[PDB]
């Protein structure tokens, strides 16, 4: 994994290093005698550590240190400056210049390979750390979005974006079971857009669906409690469950849903020439009692209320308690 | 786990003076905490509790061998990877070689000036921090990647594979066929298609049950997948008892040749059936069509049409036979 790039004008020092990194596998070596090519050599072999001689003819090791730190290609490679006359004034200045280590020309072979490996691993760990951090951010972003999408396809109505039929009915069933234990009121609204069939085959589908999308927008705005839930049972049929809600409160939301839906003023000629889209709403409510009683009985009640509503003129609200 | 720049230095020296001199250089930098320990006996325990990013260890201490204490750091799991800068008194360049072998990562002659000190303190801590973060990222990465692979595998079976036969399902086949069609328009090559239906299958399913019907299907499927062996060939279960086979760069002669291998090898499976009369076997009606896409309004759909027609005519001319699309 290691690749040592040594820079020094002394052809012998370059050898004392080569002959110590020899009996050491996993660590490539490279020797450069001409400082004028050092920067070049560095942008090619891509070392994991650079041993840079401080004093050479024509260029000092610190102006080369500024070169290695000039391009991304090598700006992160750790460098060990090698000195001859150990002058703690230049030493101090080397570190200030960013030098990562300082060695009085060639120490014990055991130490020289220990520093070479420690720096290389550090260099690679930083490389792999950022790389990982980046790939990780992508992965989690991907996974989060993928799950959002699958969730939506799983429990939501495509057009309306509201919950689908089975998601809703399963919630209704679990809410019924909990209202049975807590002996509380469970209200349900069955919402049908009036004369929608008539409307659909006279304005097309894109107009029908566009209207159903709008009505759905007035339906979710009707309930706001975290435990409240609205659905598009299918076609122009919607549903809303309101845990812990009383007949009166349920009635309020129904009426509020009806009113806001009408204030959309979606033109339609069936109720007669100059009217607009409206909805009939059946409202039911109960406190689950023991014995038989399934949530299906609450639904039968809402449907009856819905039927009564339609047969009394539509665009109004029907209630039922038993 | 440790956040970026969270430097924690642990100095283990017996001389409280050396401690104080450092316990200052590191007060002018809040982005780095400090902790001094004078008892070698607790050095490891202390490091285990404060969790340092770098430790400065005194090589010579009373009643404790220095090079052995280092080895003790490499033996504790939580400190094994912590960089150690050994502090030498008055110098000794012999202990030095031994120190690095023992696990030392850096060598300092008792307290250099705050500049070289912190450079090394931060260089080593950053290094330790990086390694710790790399492994936490690598771990969370494989976890995330696995979750995605698992999901992708589920979607593949659902989207382009048929559970029972293990063959390609219909949308995958249709998609592939369309691509082959377009490629054939470009290369002006012949594209053949076979539509394969098991004869009297329903009849067989209500008489022998799903268990047996499914196994019959699994068998036909196998005889079909063997009728074509080119890397670009593709066999698919097209429906209930309906299958399909698309053969790129195949002439009408080749297509009907392979059509017959199927009919033949299916009938030789000899899956007893009481239809169309006692003592029968499950046979296959096949429809073959082949075309060279010719430009203008004509898609891969026409190729499917033609094979369906040949299959209709084959089913109506007695079954257990090959029907060939008539050319005007
Ligand atoms: N006008 C009106 N608006 C309603 C009603 N029910 C729900 N909302 C709307 O829905 C938001 C969230 O309701 P939540 O999920 O029950 O979450 C609620 C609930 O858990 C709690 N909370 C607030 N007010 C009451 C209260 O009077 N009784 C109870 N039991 N909890 C309350 O605080 C949360 C947030 O409250 P908000 O900030 O007000 O935000 C409320 C409010 O804007 C209602 O009966 N009348
Ligand atoms: N399931 C459900 N039912 C709804 C919602 N909004 C209204 N209701 C029903 O309508 C009744 C009166 O609502 P309100 O006029 O807004 O008058 C409300 C409101 O002024 C206040 N209130 C209760 N909960 C909240 C809340 O979460 N946020 C705020 N801001 N006010 C609340 O208390 C009054 C009476 O509350 P309740 O006794 O609960 O009786 C409520 C409830 O049965 C809703 O989003 N979900
Ligand atoms: N143009 C051309 N290419 C040739 C010919 N013979 C071999 N190849 C190439 O060699 C691959 C492997 O050939 P294989 O070992 O005979 O193994 C073959 C062979 O066992 C079988 N196969 C495919 N087509 C025919 C055929 O027309 N007759 C027979 N008897 N076997 C076939 O499928 C295997 C893999 O088929 P491929 O995926 O297409 O992959 C083929 C194909 O790319 C040839 O006469 N003409
Ligand atoms: N798509 C597809 N078509 C098939 C396959 N097996 C047979 N055919 C069709 O049947 C024709 C004659 O096949 P053959 O009797 O094996 O006679 C073959 C065979 O002896 C030899 N040949 C061609 N390709 C291969 C190959 O990949 N492997 C071997 N072993 N022989 C090959 O060339 C003869 C004529 O080849 P073609 O001109 O291509 O004409 C072929 C081809 O149109 C198959 O696995 N996939
Ligand atoms: Mg020199
Ligand atoms: Mg001491």
Author numbering:
A (entry chain A): 18 to 339
B (entry chain B): 13 to 340
What does the primary publication say about this deposited structure?
WspR (PA3702 in Pseudomonas aeruginosa), often described as an ortholog of PleD, is a conserved response regulator of a chemosensory signaling system controlling biofilm formation and other adaptive phenotypic changes in Pseudomonas and related species. The N-terminal CheY-homology phospho-receiver domain is connected via a helical stalk to the GGDEF domain with diguanylate cyclase activity. Diguanylate cyclases of the GGDEF family catalyze the cyclization of two guanosine triphosphate (GTP) molecules to one c-di-GMP molecule, and have been shown to be homologous to adenylate cyclases.
We determined the crystal structure of full-length WspR from P. aeruginosa containing a CheY-homology and GGDEF domain at 2.4 Å resolution. The asymmetric unit contains two molecules with similar conformation that only differ by a 16° rigid body rotation with respect to the relative orientation of the GGDEF domain and the N-terminal regulatory unit. Due to the lack of posttranslational modifications, and considering the coordination geometry, extra density near the conserved aspartates at the active site of the CheY domains was interpreted as Mg2+ ions. The C-terminal helices of the CheY-homology domains, referred to as stalks, were clearly resolved in the electron density maps after molecular replacement, and extend to long coiled-coil–like structures that connect to the GGDEF domains. In addition, the electron density maps clearly revealed binding of an intercalated c-di-GMP dimer to a conserved inhibitory site (I-site). Cyclic di-GMP at the I-site is bound to two conserved arginine residues, R242 and R198, the latter being contributed by a symmetry-related GGDEF domain. The WspR crystal structure exists in a tetrameric assembly, with helical stalks from a C2-symmetry mate physically blocking the active sites of the diguanylate cyclase domains by being splayed apart. WspR is trapped in the crystal in a distinct inactive state that suggests a novel mechanism of feedback inhibition and activation.
